[PDB]
Symmetry: C2
């Protein structure tokens, strides 16, 4: 920015943030990622699961409402069987509240 | 009170069973205990959390279908703010089903 001399190149690969969500370990396939105009939510729920002390199923919801401008067009998400949901992308370095 | 205690049916045959459904820690009031003919279910869902790492919420569901091991009339439940749900009571000592 401005200091073109600090980049020289017209195109560069920087300005990237990496936030992570952890839950799909309970559901790798029964997980749903939906980007809602800046609202980042991960849907994860399972049906009647067996357990040591009974039958237990739960639904998990984590909602990230980032108004500062977590760009919806440029925010993608990686998910590994570990239930590691990485949301990596370029975004407004506002880092305000939650 | 004394009641029509015509006889002293004092039978302390109360070994008593004791199982716990600890989860309401995430829900003291948002918890609903339901005993349905041997079916013990604990209804509990959290409320949109507000944390710097995300606004999260979940729902817990445990279904203990114990026909020949849990009585519907004499089963009570203890709950403490700590979200500890003890189900204590005298139960029909049955042997398998059929």
């Amino acid at each position: 920015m401005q200091l073109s001399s600090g980049v020289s190149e017209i195109r560069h690969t920087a300005d990237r943030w990496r936030v992570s969500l952890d839950v799909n370990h309970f559901a790798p396939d029964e997980l749903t990622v939906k980007t809602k105009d800046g609202v980042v939510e991960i849907t994860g729920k399972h049906e009647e699961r067996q357990d040591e002390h009974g039958y237990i199923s739960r639904c998990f919801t984590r909602k990230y409402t980032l108004p500062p401008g977590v760009d919806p067009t440029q925010v993608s998400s990686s998910l590994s069987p570990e239930g590691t949901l990485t949301v990596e992308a370029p975004m407004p370095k506002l880092a305000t509240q939650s």
